[PDB]
Design a protein around this ligand. Sequence first.
Ligand SMILES: Nc1ncnc2c1ncn2[C@@H]1O[C@H](COP(=O)(O)OP(=O)(O)CP(=O)(O)O)[C@@H](O)[C@H]1O
Ligand SMILES: [Ca+2]
Ligand SMILES: [Ca+2]
Ligand SMILES: [Ca+2]
Length: 581
Amino acid sequence: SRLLGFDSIPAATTDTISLPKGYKSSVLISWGQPLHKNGPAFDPSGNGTAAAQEVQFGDNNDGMSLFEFPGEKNRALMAINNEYTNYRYLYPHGGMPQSAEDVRKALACEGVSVIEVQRKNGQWQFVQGSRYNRRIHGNSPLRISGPAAGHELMKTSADKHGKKVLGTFQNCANGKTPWGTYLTCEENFTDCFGSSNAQQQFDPAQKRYGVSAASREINWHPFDPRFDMAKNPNELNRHGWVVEIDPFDPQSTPVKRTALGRFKHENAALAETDDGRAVVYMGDDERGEFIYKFVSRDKINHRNAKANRDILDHGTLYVARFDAGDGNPDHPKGQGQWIELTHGKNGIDASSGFADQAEVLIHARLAASVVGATRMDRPEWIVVSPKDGQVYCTLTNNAKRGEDGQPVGGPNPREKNVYGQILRWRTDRDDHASKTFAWDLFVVAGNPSVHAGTPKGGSSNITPQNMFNSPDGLGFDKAGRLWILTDGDSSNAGDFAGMGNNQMLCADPATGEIRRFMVGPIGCEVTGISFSPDQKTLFVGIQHPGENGGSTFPEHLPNGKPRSSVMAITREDGGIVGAHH
Ligand SMILES: Nc1ncnc2c1ncn2[C@@H]1O[C@H](COP(=O)(O)OP(=O)(O)CP(=O)(O)O)[C@@H](O)[C@H]1O
Ligand SMILES: [Ca+2]
Ligand SMILES: [Ca+2]
Ligand SMILES: [Ca+2]
């Protein structure tokens, strides 16, 4: 292969980072790192405070973007998401929150960490004390904008006007705008709400989003009533949005962009129409949910960044329908379309339960079902190829495929999907404004060693040497290599025998060839990806190392606490990551 310059490495089960020959890794930052001058040091005992966590690098680092510092090639900002927290390591008691202070500590773990990095002697390093360093957390005051801003369904007792919300949490993956802003995505936000009333009666919209009275083992609602649906039901509507952050302004207020819809947002892939308008592809990560696309009203003003302040507040939100395709078992392919989610069109009106456009966006999932969007196998990250504009999306898995309502077909070709697949689409005329597209499955993951010759053996570009499961993250480098990050079953047994720990692989889009590049430590998942502008440093996140107690990564101190870290991957020879030596 032209694009793949290294030799595929074996699967590993070790509590370390395994890379190919000539590559090295270094810790950039880890959960608990104080961001500010003379900031509180990380407390390994779990006795660190909530206020200290609001000024320290958050937990379970996930999606991230690197931003070129104008006029300074040896400086950059990185905006990094903090998705959730690991109670076993967060509290000394290692269990459920037991107080309001414990609840505040967990909300402090989530959100975004903006940091400055500098290049010293060729290596990028975290800059503690930088004026750009900032924590945006679960209690940070944010702004609401777009068509749903100020609506009755967005009003609460604490916020009577429906334009101010406390925080961003469950921050999964990201977007990087061409106008120098960061998009952070609220994914499993519903897990954080419960009800003091166990017999709480939830309405269709709330049930469709998956809220429960018990919460999903988070339990903030018994101590913080903002999360208690019996007391603040509409707080559920003020989360599950795409939030826009300016990393270059530490005194700016982030904005929830309600025109991009409300759902369990994984990431946001930027593109541009041939007439210059912003396009944002977006996945809703839940079994049988949809793939969306937002197109801005206005053209991107590339020459004046601040002229695009309100670009994501005006446009059209669409949802995907995929046809049955040709049924080819190794490489199925077909056509699809984008259906508009606008009040008054496609049977979206008072009769189907939408009084206005704000309701269409607050209840995007319900509006997408009305227009007949295709139910998918957990859409996770999306990426647009920088060389030809083809779009790639992971469908991580779907153990419910084949059950009543989720039939087997087109881009979801297997029942009880434990491995996943990567879906590709080419927009018509290579214009991102087109309402139709050709689709194909770039890869169908599987285990050819244990299920040779069957659908569970995967597509032909999966071999016993490169096999993996549950692809989640994706990233392109400038050369056009596709980097696949996994968040799967690390048992290394049964269906996953020979797969080992979670990994990162590299693929050639034109050939379909895939090669294992990295293996992560015990109990982690590999998520988050950014490159230095020169492509000589690949930054990757290691999330929840030792989630089931088998890790001391990265420090490996005696009886050590494992810490979610951001890693800097480089070549000893100083060359471009993934390229030939
Ligand atoms: N009690 C429950 N009821 C319903 N859905 C649940 C659930 N527990 C987890 N899920 C969902 O089932 C899927 C698989 O769970 P899991 O936590 O293993 O996935 P994940 O590790 O892929 C989360 P992420 O999307 O952040 O990577 C996810 O979409 C998760 O949100
Ligand atoms: Ca993910
Ligand atoms: Ca996942
Ligand atoms: Ca995960």
